[PDB]
């Protein structure tokens, strides 16, 4: 073949991508096809193809062509395919292409053409396909297109066409497919499409059609119609009367609000129908004379009733979607043997009867989430086929049938807060994914393969409430010591019918306050003993029942009142000490008693606060407010922990102020030295035992520290109730005054 390009036999020359600026020479006149694309031929001289009389296929892609001689293409009587894409013609070379009698395919896209001469395309009696996209056309060339009776495919995409007048294609009797997508069409005249009796495919996507066109009524042979991504809002009745042969309708991405009831009648071959956002539709459409729907979708409407004949008329219905509507009752689905997917989420369905899903033998996915369902017949799913995915989440369910669900794979139950029963593992042997309203229902299918959610962490144990043996014995040790010692201390102080000083007074209520904490641990110990190895059964009942709220109230009330009381004792000790060298007598005894009642009131208010909020006490089976995986209490928990910690410093620095103001020689023999030293230990142990609880509560706010859940659980069971038992222990063994009171009690007991 002639240099620098190659000849692919069969009278074919591949001479493209060589940067040639002119028609190559040396090629035989017997050549049938020439491809010289990707070159730099910008101007074509006259008779540039003189010595190729038998050329049938000519390609001129990407040549930066600007000017063509009118007689340049003379003698190409056998030319059939002519491509001129990616050039700068800016106008259709009507004079150059006048003599192409046998031309069949003309490609003129991507040429920045802004206008077309009226005499263009004359002599193109053999044309079948014409490409005119990617240009700057502003009007439909009615007259130039009127001279192509044999045209079959016409593309005018990606242009600036604004409107189409009447009878624009009144000659294209042989047209088959017409493309007009990605244009600026905003108005279609009534008779713009007249004469296109042979048209089959029409594309009107990405336009500005504000009203449904009535001109499509004159297209009896239409098969594919697409006008999606437009401004059409209303589709009136009788729109598709003149086109009985559609197969696919594209109308998505439209401001569709109202649809004619009858509009989609007698649409044979209609294989799909998807309508979304039609908020004004209130009645189910007629879908009559249409028995070949494969997929149906009606979302965002006001439909409240579904006709019974839906499963008696539709034959090849495969997928059904009616979500986002006002459907309240469900008709019998018997007959829809080809149905596979049903989506009915976000409706007003309240019950499921036995006959609702009798006839579905090929159902695989069934969605009923976010409804008002409160009862389901036990045999509703009995007569089902290969059901694979089921979703009835966010409902008012109280029970759940299991018959016929052995083949289930995905199941969602979240939001059914009134559902208490635990699902049996033997009824869902093929389960792989499961979500349940309460984590305690995931204990059967831990997954030891079954991503059960929410995960049953250490905070929500399945086997044992307390967990390890070491933890359990300590809580028993704490409970017995707190109950026995606090009762003893309470009795001795209040059994002496003598004058009660303020310093002795605050000791008593601290023991009383710590007694309730011992009671709180008693509830946990007995609950653990009863639910030994079977806590998952009682988990739901305990948290949701009033038992958790009562136990949770005691823990908050006993803990908060303990800090407030001993803080008052610190203030009392400082004030009583000051009055010694100043006045020598304390006369605030009545005032302190009032503050003690006020101190208890503050604890009661704090204890009752989580009761008003829903689920704050139910976050953990321990009934303790903690930020771990709980926000309702996150705002509440921080308030308490800062309040307790804040109270520490003011009651601490006053002791240092008292200690500094107290001379070292005043503690030698004064009876106040023992009293001041006893509190000095209470401020110590209570402070250190509160930091681990306090600092773990700050852990969720610090993302840089990841603490595994079981660690918080162990310390909270060993440190939070620890001060309750330790406070009386120090008093009985280390306070010399208690021994004197013990002597007084023994004498009264012996006397009585
Ligand atoms: C094609 O060749 C001409 C020769 O004058 C040159 O001016 C032009 O830049 C070339 N085009 C490309 C794309 O190389
Ligand atoms: C082509 O269109 C012109 C103008 O509408 C008309 O006069 C002529 O008869 C048409 N030829 C046909 C329809 O074959
Ligand atoms: C469907 O076509 C039949 C036969 O032409 C006609 O009788 C019937 O009324 C049509 N459907 C509608 C739109 O009612
Ligand atoms: C469906 O079309 C038939 C045509 O005869 C009509 O009688 C019927 O009322 C229509 N139904 C609805 C609800 O559009």
Author numbering: 29 to 476, 519 to 822
Provide text from the study.
Leucine-rich repeat-containing G protein-coupled receptor 4 (LGR4) plays a critical role in regulating the wingless-related integration site (Wnt) signaling pathway and is essential for organ development and carcinogenesis. LGR4, along with its ligand R-spondin (RSPO), potentiates Wnt/β-catenin signaling by recruiting its signaling suppressor, E3 ligase Zinc and Ring Finger 3 (ZNRF3), and inducing its membrane clearance. Cell surface-expressed LGR4/5, members of the class A G-protein coupled receptors (GPCR) family, have an extracellular domain (ECD) comprising 17 leucine-rich repeats (LRRs), followed by a seven-transmembrane domain (TMD), and an intracellular domain (ICD). ZNRF3/RNF43, LGR4, and RSPO form a ternary complex on the cell surface, which relieves ZNRF3/RNF43-mediated suppression of Wnt/β-catenin signaling and thereby potentiates pathway activation.
We purified lauryl maltose neopentyl glycol/ cholesteryl hemisuccinate (LMNG/CHS) detergent-solubilized human LGR4 (residues 1-822) containing ECD and TMD and determined its structure using cryo-EM to a resolution of 3.5 Å. In the cryo-EM map, the ECD (residues 29-525), TMD (residues 539-822), and connecting segment between the ECD and TMD (residues 526-538) were observed and modeled, except for the extended-loop region at the end of the ECD (residues 476-518). LGR4 ECD adopts a typical horseshoe structure comprising 17 LRRs (residues 58-455) flanked by N-terminal (LRRNT, residues 29-57) and C-terminal (LRRCT, residues 456-525) caps. LGR4 TMD comprises 7-transmembrane (TM) helices typical of GPCRs. LGR4 TMD can be superimposed well on the inactive conformation of the luteinizing hormone-choriogonadotropin receptor (LHCGR/LGR2) with a root-mean-square deviation (RMSD) value of 1.08 Å. Therefore, the GPCR 7-TM structure has an inactive conformation. The ECD was tilted to about 45° relative to the membrane layer, a configuration maintained by interactions at the hinge region between the ECD and TMD, comprising the LRRCT and the following connecting segment. In the upper layer, the LRRCT helix packs complementarily against the extracellular loop (ECL)1 helix from the TMD and the adjacent connecting segment, with the Y468 side chain inserted into a small pocket formed between the ECL1 helix and the connecting segment. In the lower layer, the connecting segment formed a three-successive-turn structure that interacted extensively with the presumed ligand-binding pocket on the extracellular side of the TMD. In the inactive conformation of LGR4, F529, F696, and M782 blocked the entrance to the pocket; however, the structural transition from the inactive to the active state may allow the pocket to widen, as observed in LGR2, enabling it to accommodate such ligands.
